Design a protein around this ligand. Structure first.
Ligand SMILES: CC(C)(COP(=O)(O)OP(=O)(O)OC[C@H]1O[C@@H](n2cnc3c(N)ncnc32)[C@H](O)[C@@H]1OP(=O)(O)O)[C@@H](O)C(=O)NCCC(=O)NCCS
Length: 123
């Protein structure tokens, strides 16, 4: 499930966000984590499979659109649908505004939109 970021998860949040291509070193990591903590328009979320944090997704609220900036899943948990479940839970969470990506996560975002939601059908 999707939970808000807490300071007690800084070590795992930095480790997860380190897989983002624009996060080269650790000095830059703690600066972006400090942005998610101290900036109102920027919020970071964590995906808790069972009781272990395996994914992370952070957004920036900008007037009418909610831009996705960072999305990362633990490599040992990839290819399990966690990446799309985070966005789906994010879309339900931000039902008020429209969910758009930036140039950093446009590739994986367009893949999920092209995907078909696997739903049951009756009659
Ligand atoms: C992108 C990422 C967050 C998705 O995690 P995930 O749990 O594997 O997502 P899902 O299980 O729901 O779906 C996996 C699919 O997404 C694809 N995928 C993985 N990374 C992708 C990417 N950057 N762009 C487009 N598709 C990607 C996989 O090829 C896979 O496709 P397949 O089913 O045909 O094999 C994960 O691969 C990751 O941590 N990447 C590190 C770098 C990064 O996150 N860059 C930003 C993404 S644009």
């Amino acid at each position: 499930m999707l939970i808000r970021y807490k300071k007690s998860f800084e070590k795992i949040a930095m480790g997860l966000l380190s897989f983002m291509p624009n996060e080269k070193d650790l000095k830059q990591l703690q600066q972006t984590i400090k942005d998610y903590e101290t900036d109102t328009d920027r919020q970071l979320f964590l995906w808790k499979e069972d009781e272990d944090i395996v994914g992370a997704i952070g957004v920036e609220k900008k007037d009418s659109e909610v831009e996705i900036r960072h999305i990362s899943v633990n490599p040992s948990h990839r290819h399990q649908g966690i990446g799309k479940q985070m966005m789906d839970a994010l879309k339900h969470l931000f039902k008020t505004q429209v969910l758009v990506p930036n140039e950093l996560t446009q590739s994986f975002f367009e893949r999920c939109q092209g995907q078909q939601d696997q739903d049951i059908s009756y009659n």
